[PDB]
Design goal:
The complex is a heterodimer of chains A (464) and B (471). By secondary structure, chain A is mainly alpha-helical. Helices cover 63% and strands 1% of the residues of chain A. Chain B is built from 14 helices and 16 strands. Chain B has helices spanning 7-13, 19-46, 72-75, 82-85, 91-94, 128-139, 166-181, 197-209, 226-232, 253-266, 291-298, 350-353, 361-371, 375-378, and strands spanning 65-68, 99-102, 106-108, 116-121, 144-148, 185-188, 216-220, 240-242, 272-274, 303-308, 381-385, 391-397, 403-409, 415-416, 456-457, 462-467. The chains are: A mainly alpha (464), B alpha/beta (471). Bound molecules: 1,2-diacyl-glycerol-3-SN-phosphate (3PH), cholesterol hemisuccinate (Y01) (2 copies), the ligand N[C@@]1(C(=O)O)CCc2ccc(OCc3ccccc3-c3nc4ccccc4o3)cc2C1 and a molecule of 2 linked components (NAG-NAG) (4 copies). A molecule of 2 linked components (NAG-NAG) binds at residues 265-266 of chain B. Chain B: Its main location: membrane.
Chain lengths: 464, 471
């Protein structure tokens, strides 16, 4: 009774495309304009974040072919640095990182779905919260039913994302096709290029939100068919597509609108559709709403498989990683990753949890690649189907150190608050994993609630 | 297997009836809770009120207009033609003005009617191939150009005290000719000397709107009484009309409040034009301590504000000798006025005031940025309320957007606010505290929330407090 591999090459391309292309190409093409000023340097920022994500994805592709276990960026830290750093990453990825991301994308789905009922006004907050909590509860029940249904949802909505962005691109091409230039001039595109770079870094920090999720196929290996071919082939097909679509979307945003109406807009795609369609412009909010529907599916699919593997190493309770037989789906882990996401519907302002843990989110990717280089000069004989040309990891390590160095010298305010979360996660580690010689007051109670949930969900343990 | 059963004994135990009933009941309970939450979201969405439709504004509803009377006195000697006007079109984009009322540029000799043609440009301002070049260069910066067509702008009677209707047929023939060249509106001044004025204005309005609905027609009187203004506006009502209605006071705030509220109540809350003259500066009527207080009022009242050139720097024709008051010289830099080299200071120039963050031009730029952006100042609703002896306090509020509260102290001695509101509808009532966006005098923290019961106004001070849509 195992997890019964189903993921093809095209399903992986769908997972990466559908998880990456979510809200950030619709709710962010401004922040880079308000901290970059000129429309040329914003395109420079988007292209730079694209190259950064591509080189990091190639390093993770050769990592995932080297080690080849699920729970990527966690299994690698487990094979390199031991038990305690792997638990600390797993702990704050179970507490904060995944249930905030899924809730934020579900909320953006609900807001841009209810936008055509409230055209120039605000959507009521307990009506959008209660639809965000329906999206997660429906996708966690679709994922608990079958795996191939959950992969059919993902590539249907990945096709919908591309057909919704291609319409915006071809609407921009016929706007440049009628010979008028509000922006994108040859010599008039750099007026207000904010220099100093001091304000720029903040920018590079804003354009990387739309590229996040490129390392999510590494969580769901051991479920691909022929992974040594189909993991890097699904990465290098998916990710250069995104960095091209992300610049052909922003420059088409720049042909129609000007810099004074973009900076005075809270929904750039809605203001694009209002000018280029008029009536029958309601399809743009519902198509940027369905864009955020396929990004919660692809991130609930991998978050369950992360806590699956976190329990096989003894870092979690063993009720997780118990497969339901004849459905062959991790039900008690999907219930957990749904309940943790629905717990963030009590937060009023959780958009500022991004600055709290942006330093550790890149410190893990730095630490994984330092250990990747360290493993090559320590165990220099494994089956390596794809080896990377070096000094791209050397570039990426110091680039992630440059991205973490602006968290301590520019805005060091909340990083000390964020560090206390990890050091409060440490005694949880000691109590849960390290404290053996356990008394029978607690161990039999643990066995009793585990067999209770086991009889309730009808799940059996794994077994090669 | 690890801290639980294995497959065999689990399917042995947990396959009994009752244990199947519990999990089927829990699945049914899950789906009933989901269909309860969906209907809850539906009846929350339906019980949200509505939100209002935008009122389909024109381009002159969006910001201010800028009157340039004499073209030579705007630049200076030498480059006092239409080609030199093209170089200033980014300073006008700094002011965020939406329109430009160019002065009369046609060929007017003097009081001879037959030697006055409105279709031909006088050669001292340029030619038509410079004029459409200026028009196409101003269309790039989102600035519309309005052409003044007052015929006898060099004599004393502007409508030729001789033959009457013949000089109006050549205005009727010139509207069509200049509208195809691409101007965005027209202005006629001094129409208290025009015979059958209310009949001619309706004909010219129907000609101008019969071309496009993006076309303006401004009229100007020297009248100051309300019943003579309302007589011009009873047939045609899309007409902008600048006059000297607010010019009279220069004084206490009760009279200004009564003038604004009586005009807005008599005209039925239509789109009006707020001004202090038809061709004159603000310093012709106001002392120099009341310019910042009037600039805050003219940008926050429900209409189109119309200014002359030099009103942003406080230009004064009675501060420099040897200049006509109908056309003073624009002080761009320290070398602008050539006679008496040293009479012009540094705080009286454009570039000397573009550096000070507490200047007069720095107030104009902030207010003109706030007016053309916020929906409560674009098409909000006006409500003035009662206050202390010498105050003018009002509120703008559109639908659910960020509300605005303007408090003006026209008095000479200081006093408190005393904002006994008690009169506004529930969508715009006062909170217990509000922000501070702006003040016309230094000595206050711009951004920090005050509370609106210990509000104190020092002499000639105005405040621009702000508060959102709440209870
Ligand atoms: C929500 C419903 C989901 C449905 C499925 C049910 C799954 C249950 C979800 C439980 C999630 C727990 C995740 C975090 C667990 C960390 C502990 C751990 O890894 O144990 C492995 C360890 C592995 O046991 P094994 O399964 O026998 O290998 O688990 C345990 O022994 C029991 C741990 C229970 C933890 C309950 C919460 C305790 C929080 C910390 C309490 C304070 C500790 C320090 C005391 C002094 C404080 C100053
Ligand atoms: C507009 C949005 C916000 C509302 C929800 C979108 C869809 C209307 C929902 C309704 C139920 C969902 C899915 C429910 C389960 C599957 C069954 C699936 O059939 C199978 O192949 C699996 C069956 C099996 O394995 O036995 C095909 C349709 C699909 C993806 C459904 C497609 C449509 C989904 C995503
Ligand atoms: C807070 C936690 C500890 C409570 C967990 C409650 C679960 C969310 C509930 C909801 C519905 C319940 C179960 C209802 C019946 C079973 C058997 C299963 O039935 C089948 O579809 C298989 C039969 C077939 O293949 O024909 C459906 C899913 C499942 C595991 C469900 C798993 C989740 C249960 C225990
Ligand atoms: N690019 C996406 C898109 O839809 O645009 C596609 C899906 C995806 C997957 C992972 C991801 O990692 C973000 C992250 C990493 C470490 C610590 C915090 C956060 C964080 N995520 C947030 C979401 C919303 C508001 C604040 C947030 O802070 C971002 C995105 C967005
Ligand atoms: C503007 O005025 C003219 C007349 O002064 C109106 O045009 C007339 O319309 C009727 C009905 O079609 C015709 O029979 C006349 O020949 C027209 N007279 C003209 C063109 O001189 C016109 O309706 C007015 N505009 C508006 C909006 O009412
Ligand atoms: C507007 O200006 C005129 C001239 O400065 C004022 O005087 C009028 O002048 C005309 C001849 O040009 C006479 O026919 C009128 O009788 C004059 N008016 C009066 C009241 O005697 C005119 O008064 C000004 N308008 C206002 C409202 O003050
Ligand atoms: C200003 O508005 C008020 C009420 O909205 C009008 O005042 C009324 O006028 C009628 C005569 O038309 C009187 O019989 C009422 O007693 C007045 N009521 C009040 C409360 O004053 C007034 O007419 C409007 N102003 C103008 C110029 O029309
Ligand atoms: C520009 O600044 C000068 C001083 O730098 C101002 O001159 C002052 O004028 C007032 C009233 O005329 C006098 O009481 C002061 O003594 C003058 N200052 C000095 C240093 O002598 C001038 O008024 C300013 N101009 C404007 C338009 O504000």
């Amino acid at each position: 009774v195992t997890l019964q591999r189903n993921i093809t090459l095209l399903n992986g391309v769908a997972i990466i495309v559908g998880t990456i292309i979510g809200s950030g190409i619709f709710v962010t093409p401004t922040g880079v304009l308000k901290e970059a000023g000129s429309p040329g340097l914003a395109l420079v920022v988007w292209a730079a974040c694209g190259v950064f994500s591509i080189v990091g994805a190639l390093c993770y592709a050769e990592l995932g072919t080297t080690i080849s276990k699920s729970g990527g960026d966690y299994a690698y830290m487990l094979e390199v640095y031991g038990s305690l750093p792997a638990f600390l990453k797993l702990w704050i990825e179970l507490l904060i990182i995944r249930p905030s991301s899924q809730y934020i994308v579900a909320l953006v789905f609900a807001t841009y779905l209810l936008k055509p009922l409230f055209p120039t006004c605000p959507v009521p907050e307990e009506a959008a919260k209660l639809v965000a909590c329906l999206c997660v509860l429906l996708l966690t029940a679709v994922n608990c039913y079958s795996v191939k249904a959950a992969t059919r949802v993902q590539d249907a909505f990945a096709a919908a994302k591309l057909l919704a962005l291609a319409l915006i691109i071809l609407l921009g091409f016929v706007q440049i096709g009628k010979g008028d230039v509000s922006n994108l001039d040859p010599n008039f595109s750099f007026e207000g290029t904010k220099l100093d770079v001091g304000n720029i870094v903040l920018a590079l920090y804003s354009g990387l939100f739309a590229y996040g999720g490129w390392n999510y196929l590494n969580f769901v290996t051991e479920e691909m068919i022929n992974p040594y071919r189909n993991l890097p082939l699904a990465i290098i097909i998916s990710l250069p597509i995104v960095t091209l679509v992300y610049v052909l979307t922003n420059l088409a945003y720049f042909t129609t609108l000007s810099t004074e109406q973009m900076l005075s807009s809270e929904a750039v795609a809605v203001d694009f559709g209002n000018y280029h369609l008029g009536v029958m412009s309601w399809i743009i909010p519902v198509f940027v709403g369905l864009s955020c529907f396929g990004s919660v599916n692809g991130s609930l699919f991998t978050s369950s498989r992360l806590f699956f593997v976190g329990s096989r190493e003894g870092h979690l309770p063993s009720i997780l990683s118990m497969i339901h037989p004849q459905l062959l789906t991790p039900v008690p882990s999907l219930v957990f990753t749904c309940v943790m996401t629905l717990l963030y519907a009590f937060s009023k302002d959780i958009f500022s949890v991004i600055n709290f843990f942006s330093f550790f989110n890149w410190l893990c990717v730095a630490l994984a690649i330092i250990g990747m280089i360290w493993l090559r000069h320590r165990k220099p004989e494994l089956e390596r189907p794809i080896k990377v040309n070096l000094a791209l990891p050397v570039f990426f390590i110091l680039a992630c150190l440059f991205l973490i160095a602006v968290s301590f010298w520019k805005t060091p305010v909340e990083c000390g608050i964020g560090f206390t979360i990890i050091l409060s996660g440490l005694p949880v580690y000691f109590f849960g994993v390290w404290w053996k010689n356990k008394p029978k007051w607690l161990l039999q109670g643990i066995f009793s609630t585990t067999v209770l949930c086991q009889k309730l969900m009808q799940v059996v343990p794994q077994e090669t | 297997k690890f801290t639980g059963l294995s497959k065999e004994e689990l399917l042995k135990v947990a396959g009994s009836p009752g244990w199947v009933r519990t999990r089927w009941a829990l699945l049914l309970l899950f789906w009933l809770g989901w269909l309860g939450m969906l209907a809850g979201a539906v009846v929350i969405i339906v019980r949200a009120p509505r939100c209002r439709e935008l009122p389909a504004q024109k381009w002159w509803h969006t910001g201010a207009l800028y009157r340039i009377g004499d073209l030579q006195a705007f630049q200076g000697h030498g480059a006092g033609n239409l080609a030199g006007l093209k170089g200033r079109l980014d300073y006008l984009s700094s002011l965020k003005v939406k329109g430009l009322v160019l002065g009369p540029i046609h060929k007017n000799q003097k009081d001879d009617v037959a030697q006055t043609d409105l279709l031909q440009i006088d050669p001292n301002f340029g030619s038509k191939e410079d004029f459409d070049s200026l028009l196409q260069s101003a269309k790039k910066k989102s600035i519309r150009v309005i052409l003044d067509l007052t015929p006898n702008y060099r004599g004393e009677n502007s409508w030729f005290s001789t033959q009457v209707d013949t000089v109006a047929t050549k205005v009727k023939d010139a509207l069509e000719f200049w509208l195809q060249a691409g101007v965005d509106g027209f202005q006629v001044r001094d129409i208290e000397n025009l015979k059958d004025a209310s009949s001619f204005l309706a004909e010219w309005q129907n000609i101008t709107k019969g071309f496009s609905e993006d076309r303006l027609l401004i009229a100007g009187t020297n009248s100051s009484d309300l019943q003579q203004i309302l007589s011009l506006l009873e047939s045609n009502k899309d007409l902008l009309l600048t006059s000297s209605y607010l010019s009279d006071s220069g004084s206490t705030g009760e009279h200004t409040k009564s003038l604004v509220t009586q005009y807005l109540n008599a005209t039925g809350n239509r789109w009006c034009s707020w001004s202090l003259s038809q061709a004159r500066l603000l310093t012709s009527f106001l002392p120099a301590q009341l310019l910042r207080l009037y600039q805050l009022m003219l940008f926050t009242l429900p209409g189109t504000p119309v200014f002359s050139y030099g009103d942003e720097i406080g230009l004064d024709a009675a501060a420099l000798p040897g200049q006509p008051m109908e056309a003073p010289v624009m002080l761009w830099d320290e070398s602008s006025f050539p006679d008496i080299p040293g009479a012009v200071s540094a705080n009286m120039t454009v570039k000397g005031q573009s550096e000070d963050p507490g200047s007069l031009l720095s107030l104009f730029r902030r207010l003109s940025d706030q007016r053309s952006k916020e929906r409560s100042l674009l098409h909000g609703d006006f409500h003035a309320f009662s206050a202390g002896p010498g105050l003018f306090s009002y509120i703008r509020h559109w639908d659910q957007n960020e509300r605005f509260l303007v408090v003006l102290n026209f008095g000479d001695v200081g006093l408190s606010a005393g904002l006994q509101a008690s009169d506004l509808p529930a969508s715009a009532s006062l909170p217990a505290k509000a922000d501070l966006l702006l003040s016309t005098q230094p000595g206050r923290e711009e951004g920090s929330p005050l509370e609106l019961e210990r509000l104190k106004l020092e002499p000639h001070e105005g405040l621009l407090l702000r508060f959102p849509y709440a209870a």
